[PDB]
A paper describes a structure:
Foot-and-mouth disease virus (FMDV) is a highly contagious virus responsible for causing serious livestock disease. The virus forms an icosahedral capsid from 60 copies each of the viral proteins, VP0, VP1 and VP3, organised in the form of twelve pentamers. VP1–3 are surface exposed, each adopting an 8-stranded β-barrel conformation with extended N and C-termini, with VP1 surrounding the 5-fold axes of symmetry, and VP2 and VP3 alternating around the icosahedral 3-fold axes. In the acidic environment of the endocytic compartments the virus particle dissociates into pentamers, releasing the RNA into the cell to produce viral progeny.
Here we have determined the low-resolution structure of isolated pentamers formed by the acid treatment of infectious, native FMDV particles and in addition have captured an icosahedral assembly of these pentamers, which have associated with the reverse curvature to their normal organisation in the mature native particle. These ‘inside-out’ particles were characterised at a resolution of 5.2 Å, using cryo-electron microscopy (cryo-EM). Analysis of the unusual assemblies revealed them to be slightly expanded compared to native FMDV capsids (312 Å in diameter compared to 297 Å). Convincing initial rigid-body fitting, assuming that the shell represented an expanded particle with collapsed 5-folds, was possible only when the whole pentamer of the native virus was turned upside down and VP4 removed. It was then immediately apparent that the structure of the pentamer seen in the mature virus was broadly maintained, with VP4 not detected and portions of the N-termini of VP1 and VP2 disordered. The final model comprises residues 27–208 of VP1, 29–210 of VP2 and 1–221 of VP3. The interactions at the pentamer interfaces in the inside-out particle derived by analysis of the EM density at the protein interface of VP2-VP3, showed that the pentamer-pentamer interactions are weak and have fewer hydrogen bonds and salt bridges than observed in the native capsid. The BC loop of VP3 (residues 68–73) and the adjacent EF loop (residues 135–136) interact with a strand of VP2 composed of residues 62–68 and the CD loop (residues VP2 85–88) respectively, of the opposing pentamer to stabilise the assembly. Most notable is a 4.6° rotation of the bulk of VP3 compared to its position in the native virion, when the protomer structures are superimposed on VP1. Thus correct re-assembly of pentamers is hindered by the absence of both VP4 and the N-terminus of VP1 and the accompanying minor structural changes that have occurred in VP2 and in particular the rotation of VP3, which would introduce steric clashes with the opposing VP2 in the native particle structure.
Author numbering:
A (entry chain 3): 1 to 221
B (entry chain 1): 27 to 133, 155 to 208
C (entry chain 2): 29 to 210
The structure:
Amino acid sequence: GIFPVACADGYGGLVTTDPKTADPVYGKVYNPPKTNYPGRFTNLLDVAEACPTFLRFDDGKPYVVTRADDTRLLAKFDVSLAAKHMSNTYLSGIAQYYTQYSGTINLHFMFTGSTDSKARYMVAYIPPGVETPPDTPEEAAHCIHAEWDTGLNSKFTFSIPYVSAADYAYTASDTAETTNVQGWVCVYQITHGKAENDTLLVSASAGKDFELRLPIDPRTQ
Amino acid sequence: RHHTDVGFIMDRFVKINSLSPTHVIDLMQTHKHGIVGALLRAATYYFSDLEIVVRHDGNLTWVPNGAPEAALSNTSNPTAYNKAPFTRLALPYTAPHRVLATVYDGTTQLPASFNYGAIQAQAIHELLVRMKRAELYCPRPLLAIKVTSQDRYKQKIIAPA
Amino acid sequence: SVGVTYGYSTEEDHVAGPNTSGLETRVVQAERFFKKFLFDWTTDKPFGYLTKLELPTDHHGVFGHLVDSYAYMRNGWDVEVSAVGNQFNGGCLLVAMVPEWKAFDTREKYQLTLFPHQFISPRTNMTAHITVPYLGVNRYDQYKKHKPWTLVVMVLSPLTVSNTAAPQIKVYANIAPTYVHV
C-alpha cells in the first residue's frame, strides 16, 4: 500500500534566501522573559529621525566660517548620498549598503552670536542642471526659498523635495556622464548687524519619507 | 517602511576564516566590514537563536558551554554521524547571562562568557552561521567608506554589451 | 528652563523584590550630592578636544562605604551639569551620558550624539539635567572589576570672547546616585 512517490526532478538547492528551518538536539530549554529592558529599537528609520548630523568642509571643522562683512554669498556645498559633503553621516552610512532609495534629506541650523544682534538669512534650493548658480537671493528665490531670523528663535529645520528622473534613483554614482545629480543648494543672507565673530551649524536627519531597497555588499570583504 | 526590521536582514550566512580540529563558535570571530557585522556590531545588547551549516568529513561533534573540553570525544554526547554532501543544524541557547554584547570595559581582551560553543571533528573545511529572531539594544556609531579625491565619488557600474 | 530630559523612559520605578532585594532593599540614607571638577575651557582649545571621566570615583560617604563593601548591588544615576559665564561670548559644547565607553578615533568624532545628550551655549542653556536607568549583563553588578557608565563632554563650537567677559571659564556638574538597591 505505497503512496505514489513523486521524486523531485531537479530542485532543492542549498541557496541563501531560503526560509527553511531545522531541528534542535540538546533542545527544550526555557529562558527568562526579556521584556522591560530599555534600549529597544526595531528600525534604523525611527532612530534615524531623532538625531541630527554634522557636515564637513575643507577646514576639517564642522562649523562654517561666518563673516560679518559686506559679502553677499555665504558658501556653496553639494548635497547627495555619496559626496564629500556628507560622508561622516548616519543617513549615508546606513545608505551605502543600498541601491534603491526614496526620501527627503532634512536639515538644521544653530546660531552663535548674542541674542541681541539682528540678522537675516535666506535658504535657497537649486535644481540639478540650471547651468548657472544664482548670484542674488531674489533671483535665487525662484527655485525654493524661505526665511528665519535671529528673532524669537534660534533653531530651524528645512528640507528639499525628493526630485528625480523617476520614482527611484541610484545611490552610488557613475563614471559615464558629467552632470551633477542635485545641485548646489545653499543659503543667502541680508546685512549683518554686528559681530566680532559668529558661527553656523548644519546637520541632516531622516523625517517622514526616507526609504531604501536592498541589499548587496559593496566592500572588499 | 518595510525594511530596517533586522528580523529580515539578519537571516543569512557569512564566512569564517579560522579553523582547527577543535574550533570555537562565537560571533566576534566575524569580519568587521562584512555587512553581517555591519549592523551586528552596530548595537550594544543583542539576542537570537542559532542556526549553522557545515561542510566537513568524519564525525562532527558539539557541546553546550561550560564543560570540560577534555570530555568530548568519549561517551558520544549528543551528535549524529556523517553524511555527504550538505549538513544543516540549529543550536539553541545556553546563556550564562541574559543577553549578549560586544565589549566590556574592565581593567581589552574579550570576556570568557559569551560562547555559542565549539565544534570538533576529524576534517572541518567549510563553516556557515545564521542568526534567528534577533533583537538589538542601545545602538552604536557607524562609518562609511573614506573619501580621498575631490568632487563626490566615482564608481564603475555594470552595463550590457 | 529647557526642563528635564530622561533616558529612554520616564516613570516611577520598581522598589521592592525578592530574597536578593529583600536582602538588598532600597536603603535611602546612602544618598547625597557632591560636586566634581570638569576642565578648563578658554579660547585656546581647538575642536575635537576630548576629555573623559570614569564613574564612580571614591567618596567619603556611606555610599562610598558600601561601594567599597565589595558585594552585589545596583543603582540609578541622575546628572545635572552647569557652568557660569556672561552674555558676551559664543559657541557650544557637547554633553552626553555614555553607555559602554571605548577609546574613540578621529573620523568618528563627527559622531558623538547617538546617546542621550544636550547642547551647551551661553544663550540657550545654563543647567543640564539628565538621568539614565540601570542596566547590566547580570541582574546586578560589583564595581571594582568593571564600570558600565561614564559621562562625557567635548568641544563642539569654537568659543569667542570680547573685552567684556572673563577670559577664563570653569564648568561643574552634579553626580547623584538614585533609586539604589544595595
